[PDB]
Curated annotation (Swiss-Prot):
Residue list for modification Pros-methylhistidine: 712
Annotated ATP binding sites: 176-183
Domain annotation IQ: ranges: 740-769
Segment forming the signal sequence: none
Swiss-Prot/TrEMBL domain comment: The rodlike tail sequence is highly repetitive, showing cycles of a 28-residue repeat pattern composed of 4 heptapeptides, characteristic for alpha-helical coiled coils.
Function: Muscle contraction. Myosin is a protein that binds to F-actin and has ATPase activity that is activated by F-actin.
Modified residues annotated as N6,N6,N6-trimethyllysine in this record: 127, 537
Myosin N-terminal SH3-like domain location: 30-79
Similarity comment: Belongs to the TRAFAC class myosin-kinesin ATPase superfamily. Myosin family.
Annotated protein name in UniProt: Myosin heavy chain, skeletal muscle, adult
Myosin motor domain location: 83-737
Region of interest (Hinge), residue spans: 795-797
Location of this fragment in the whole protein: 5 to 844 of 1939
């Protein structure tokens, strides 16, 4: 309260009033009966234990329901002292339910930032908050996370701190599902850096920023979950200087959703750019590109939806536009970009027909080709030929091959995608180029934004790539934690031995990335001119099946070819298209043309003209390496309800995320050592009362534990604090709880007593003053009707 001022307005969303707290922590609690429990419809709901079936349990509910569930379908409930704990990992009850429940409660109270160990959980508000408030920014400036409530700037500032304090580089790993809202955070983190440490005495700080809105036009789109979903991953290196002021940046893109460019689900839409451009805010563009304003003229981009109410395509177009400029692009390039982005639309309009009596493809017109050709700095003909009569090079020569209608339509689409991609890559590079300064760099802070392990009934190639990324990231953490943990027990002097927590995952990783592992078998077969998905499949089995544990054959319940056992769970993978997808087949004749375009930029993009998965790995390595020479800082973004409602949460939906997040695994690892750790004074005060009759701030706590019918095992002391297992501290409190009933109940009484004791002193005083009043009135009632008295009355005045 006193403290909070800086935020003031934000306060309510960060922390609660000092009594709201007090009124919550200091309330009645019955441990032995209060509990969390399993629940067929709702995941876990709370209840009170009624009876005990010897290994069955009957419980009442909170809503009113009675269920008899197993002994382990029943989970304890934290004392009220842990209501809306900033750090769930401080709880003495490391369960599945208690975690769900803590998040949930502080959300219904509009607190989106709650920590779970090292993590910084974040829940989508689905509404506006004064949190990103320009006052807060300062507030969180120069503060350890113990000096302030759970928030992202905490993480983000500490990084900075730590950056200069330890002289080590840092990282922030943001991760969550499609609708969790990471970009938002990422961006928000970024601003943070720029603000709190700017040297733009236009400027980096803007380019840095301006970056986003370009990438977003090209790599973002309306997903059925988000309205501005990130369809790619990213890694920025903010290179801080020596002083501590901004010096450079560095972007890198991973796994772009090439498919949007050509397709789109029914409730979704393609990249924004397209819709931006056809919006008509810059009419020249429309004529320049040779298109219309009606998207239904471009199949590639109107398969799903065209307009989104929450987005103003017109405004963005400029945003985008302007960003390009700031970004230092040449008009020409800025022209290539546009012109190139329209060609692609046109391609999807390119039509063909079967040559008569032949199964060959022949152009169905030179209307569109003409445009595509011109826009790319190509020749209509040359183009349509190459497309139709792909001139290959089998043997030591160049053999002209004929294609089918179906083959063309598909190749076209392949270039459309190919071109878009590349371009996107280029833009990034060009950005990076501007973001390159000469000034010295001493450290950087990496901000990684990528997707998290998502499980679908249908898991294809793309899923593997992402999952693999995450399973790595996870191990990355598990280790950092192992390293970290072990320092405490070393600092304190506890005697705890334990194996790296990462190790548990090495099994899965090796199976994927190692030489005779999935990828390899995948990338080898890609070399066999006559291999099949089926072929590949068998190779996969013959070599891993029965011999590898994490390797399994799918359990029918679409289809599946192989399941893997990732940390988050079992993923059923479908291998169909892989071979292809992995080959990135492109009509080289055409590429030829590009290579000699009049449109330099286009020419450039394709000068570098090996498998797909071959890089992904290389890039993913270059990354995980950059991640190592870093002090990892973790941020887990969460999505409350599919339905988009603030203050709400579906259970199992959040539960999911938690497992795949790492949150539930961090709790696990926590609960294996000595979770809760009490600082000695903090230990005295709160528990003295337990055997108060049994000094030093340390030796005391020691001495104290002398009493109690408690496991003298479950704890462990050390130089600054005691270590305790689970549900212990919970046990403590309980005893404590009883001890206050004693203390209070007795203190109440006297009061009560005393209270009335003063009433008697008043009653008594009053004794006569009443009478006086009593009798006095009565007189009058009698008198007022008496002649003599009325007389006296009229007369009483004439007197003196």
């Amino acid at each position: 309260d006193a403290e909070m001022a800086a935020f003031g307005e934000a306060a309510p969303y960060l922390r609660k009033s000092e009594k709201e707290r007090i009124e919550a922590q200091n309330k009645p609690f019955d441990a032995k009966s209060s509990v969390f429990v399993v629940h067929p419809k709702q995941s876990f709901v709370k209840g009170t234990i009624q009876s005990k079936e010897g290994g069955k349990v009957t419980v009442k509910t909170e809503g009113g329901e009675t269920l008899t569930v197993k002994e382990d379908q029943v989970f304890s409930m934290n004392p009220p002292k842990y209501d809306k704990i900033e750090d769930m990992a401080m709880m003495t009850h490391l369960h599945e339910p208690a975690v769900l429940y803590n998040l949930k409660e502080r959300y219904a109270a509009w607190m989106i930032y709650t920590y779970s160990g090292l993590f910084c959980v974040t829940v989508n508000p689905y509404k506006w908050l004064p949190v990103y408030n320009p006052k807060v920014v300062l507030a969180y400036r120069g503060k350890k996370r113990q000096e302030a409530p759970p928030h992202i700037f905490s993480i983000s500032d500490n990084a900075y701190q730590f950056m200069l304090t330890d002289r080590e580089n840092q990282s922030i790993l943001i991760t969550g599902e499609s609708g969790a809202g990471k970009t938002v955070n990422t961006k928000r983190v970024i601003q943070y850096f720029a603000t709190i440490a700017a040297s733009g005495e236009g400027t980096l700080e803007d380019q840095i920023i301006s970056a986003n809105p370009l990438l977003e036009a090209f790599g973002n789109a309306k997903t059925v979950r988000n309205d501005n979903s990130s369809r790619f991953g990213k890694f920025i290196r903010i290179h801080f200087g020596a002083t501590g002021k901004l010096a450079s940046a560095d972007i890198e893109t991973y796994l772009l959703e090439k498919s949007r460019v050509t397709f789109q689900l029914p409730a979704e839409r393609s990249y924004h750019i397209f819709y931006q451009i056809m919006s008509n805010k810059k009419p020249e563009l429309i004529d320049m590109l040779l298109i219309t304003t009606n998207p239904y003229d471009y199949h590639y981009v109107s398969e799903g939806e065209i307009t989104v109410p929450s987005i103003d395509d017109q405004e963005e177009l400029m945003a985008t536009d302007s960003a390009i400029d700031i970004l230092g692009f040449s008009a020409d390039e800025k022209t290539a970009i546009y012109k190139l982005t329209g060609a692609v639309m046109h391609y999807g309009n390119l039509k063909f027909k079967q040559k008569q009596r032949e199964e060959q493809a022949e152009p169905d017109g030179t209307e569109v080709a003409d445009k595509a050709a011109y826009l790319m700095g190509l020749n209509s003909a040359e183009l349509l030929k190459a497309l139709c009569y792909p001139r290959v090079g089998v043997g030591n020569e160049a053999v002209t091959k004929g294609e089918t209608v179906s083959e063309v339509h598909n190749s076209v689409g392949a270039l459309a995608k190919a071109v878009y991609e590349k371009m996107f890559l280029w833009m990034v590079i060009r950005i990076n180029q501007q973001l390159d300064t000469k000034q010295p760099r001493q450290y950087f802070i990496g901000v990684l934004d990528i997707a998290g392990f998502e499980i679908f009934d249908f898991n294809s190639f793309e899923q593997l790539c992402i999952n693999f990324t995450n399973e790595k990231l996870q191990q990355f953490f598990n280790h950092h934690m192992f390293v970290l943990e072990q320092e405490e027990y070393k600092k304190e002097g506890i005697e705890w031995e334990f194996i790296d927590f990462g190790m548990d995952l090495a099994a899965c990783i090796e199976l994927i990335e190692k030489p005779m592992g999935i990828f390899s078998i995948l990338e080898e077969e890609c070399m066999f001119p006559k291999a099949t998905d089926t072929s590949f499949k068998n190779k996969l089995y013959d070599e891993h099946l029965g011999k590898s544990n994490n390797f399994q054959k799918p359990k029918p319940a679409a289809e599946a070819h192989f399941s893997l056992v990732h940390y988050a769970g079992t993923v059923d993978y479908n291998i169909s298209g892989w071979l292809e997808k992995n080959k990135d087949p492109l009509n080289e004749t055409v590429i030829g043309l590009y290579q000699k375009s009049s449109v330099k930029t286009l020419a450039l993009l394709f000068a570098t003209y090996q498998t797909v998965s071959a890089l992904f790995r290389e890039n993913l390595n270059k990354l995980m390496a950059n991640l190592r020479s870093t002090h990892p800082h973790f941020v887990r973004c969460i999505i409350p309800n599919e339905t988009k409602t603030p203050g709400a949460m579906e259970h199992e939906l959040v539960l999911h995320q938690l497992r795949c997040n790492g949150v539930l695994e961090g709790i696990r690892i926590c609960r294996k050592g000595f979770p809760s750790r009490v600082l000695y004074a903090d230990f005295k005060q709160r528990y003295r009362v337990l055997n108060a009759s049994a000094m030093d701030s340390k030796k005391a706590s020691e001495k104290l534990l002398g009493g109690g019918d408690v496991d003298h095992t479950q704890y462990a002391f050390g130089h600054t604090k005691v270590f305790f297992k689970a549900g212990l501290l919970g046990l403590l409190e309980e005893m404590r709880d009883d001890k206050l009933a004693e203390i209070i109940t007795a203190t109440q009484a006297r009061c009560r007593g005393f209270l009335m004791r003063v009433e008697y002193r008043a009653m008594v005083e009053r004794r006569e003053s009443i009478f006086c009043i009593q009798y006095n009135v009565r007189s009058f009632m009698n008198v007022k009707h008496w002649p003599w008295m009325k007389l006296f009355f009229k007369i009483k005045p004439l007197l003196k």
